[PDB]
Design a protein around this ligand. Structure first.
Ligand SMILES: CCOc1ccc(C(=O)Nc2ccc(F)c([C@@]3(C)N=C(N)OCC3(F)F)c2)nc1
Ligand code: NA
Ligand code: NA
Length: 381
């Protein structure tokens, strides 16, 4: 409990391509890099020589592979994958010292799923059986892990943002206290499908947006390591952009910047971080009428875009975007914080991440308690 030196720094990635962990599947073990995704529930790996993939799962080489004789077709908003279901032995080399027999979807056809130039070749869905494909009887990886071993039913994620390499830690079965400063504050998991939570108040530079709080969770809010942006429901995004624009008035930007339709660039070394406001989300706390708040910086929500082969300078993408699927606390929130997915107690903890990017005027923050009434009304039904 509290100290997991073998798992610290077991995540890697490149800016904008996600965080992956090394895993092995089959006997003898086949090594694969697997995207860590708290916003889905399937363990699905490339199983055929797609030209973007460095490595793929070759079932015919595993003596422990069992075929489930069932296909799975999974369409997303953009892109899709299709695969064949099976189970095999799975390990995490920089994880606990155990082997699990787990469901795997061997991906045999996909479209817009794998990223050209990325170093991962499958996805580890860490959320619950209820959003598993094809249905909730396909047991997710983490549930198999907790059933078959003595690993405690929680994991924690420290995502450290930055061609450029990102890194992080996924502590499986526990919390490592060197990964955060101050205290952890916990918000209830409202329902176990996504890691769904409830936002009770939103402030821009300390100014309340003053919306009905059910607008903040329309139709859900979730914590998702497999999404880059802070996504906000359309109505909330309009109000939030309007405050942000007002708060940073000392400079003007094309409208398209705020919509993610164009980048903005300044000369190297001179990003004026200080004209942009902090953003605070208050979350439902553990006790009636009690909330706490997490605050991120422009260093989290203005993301550097390295590969602009038609510019000299320092270009950034605005990484807060409008959503129709509810609020998504993606890598933009999570790179501020050490986040604890405490499934045994159905709660999610946040603490200031010991690695988050900041400057000498401001820092990400997790603070409470605050008195907030009517937090139950904030959930959408
Ligand atoms: C800081 C960068 O963070 C990231 C960058 C890229 C990526 C990435 O490619 N994610 C990614 C790729 C394919 C995919 F299928 C998914 C799914 C299943 N999972 C989530 N939660 O949302 C989109 C999705 F439902 F389709 C995510 N993720 C995080
Ligand atoms: Na057990
Ligand atoms: Na600590």
């Amino acid at each position: 409990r509290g100290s997991f030196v073998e798992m610290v720094d077991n995540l890697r990635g490149k800016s904008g391509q996600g965080y992956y962990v090394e895993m092995t599947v089959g006997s003898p073990p086949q090594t694969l890099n697997i995207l860590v995704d708290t916003g889905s529930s399937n363990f699905a790996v490339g199983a055929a020589p797609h030209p973007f993939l460095h490595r793929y799962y070759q079932r015919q080489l595993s003596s422990t592979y069992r075929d489930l004789r069932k296909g799975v077709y999974v369409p997303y908003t953009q892109g899709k994958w299709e695969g064949e279901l099976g189970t095999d032995l799975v390990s995490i080399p920089h994880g606990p010292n155990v082997t699990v027999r787990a469901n795997i979807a061997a991906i045999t056809e996909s479209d817009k799923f794998f990223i050209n130039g990325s170093n991962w070749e499958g996805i580890l869905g860490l959320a619950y059986a209820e959003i598993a494909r094809p249905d909730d009887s396909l047991e997710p990886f983490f549930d198999s892990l907790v059933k078959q071993t003595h690993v405690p039913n929680l994991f924690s994620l420290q995502l450290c943002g930055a061609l450029a390499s990102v890194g992080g830690s996924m502590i499986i079965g526990g919390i490592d206290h060197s990964l955060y400063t101050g205290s952890l504050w916990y918000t209830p998991i409202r329902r176990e499908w996504y890691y769904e939570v409830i936002i009770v108040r939103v402030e821009i530079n300390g100014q309340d947006l003053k919306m009905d709080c059910k607008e903040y969770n329309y139709d859900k809010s979730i914590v998702d390591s497999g999404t880059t942006n802070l996504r906000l429901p359309k109505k909330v995004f309009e109000a939030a952009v309007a405050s942000i624009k007002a708060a940073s008035s000392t400079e003007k930007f094309p409208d398209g910047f705020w919509l993610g339709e164009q980048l903005v660039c300044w000369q190297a070394g001179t990003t004026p971080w200080n004209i942009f406001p902090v953003i605070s989300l208050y979350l439902m706390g553990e006790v009636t009428n009690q909330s706490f708040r997490i605050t991120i910086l422009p260093q989290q929500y203005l993301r550097p875009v390295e590969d602009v082969a038609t510019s000299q300078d320092d270009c950034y993408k605005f990484a807060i975007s409008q959503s129709s699927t509810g609020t998504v606390m993606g890598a933009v929130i999570m790179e501020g914080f050490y986040v604890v997915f405490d499934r045994a107690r159905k709660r999610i903890g946040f603490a200031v991440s010991a690695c988050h990017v900041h400057d000498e005027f401001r820092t990400a923050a997790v603070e409470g308690p605050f008195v907030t009434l009517d937090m139950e009304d904030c959930g959408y039904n």
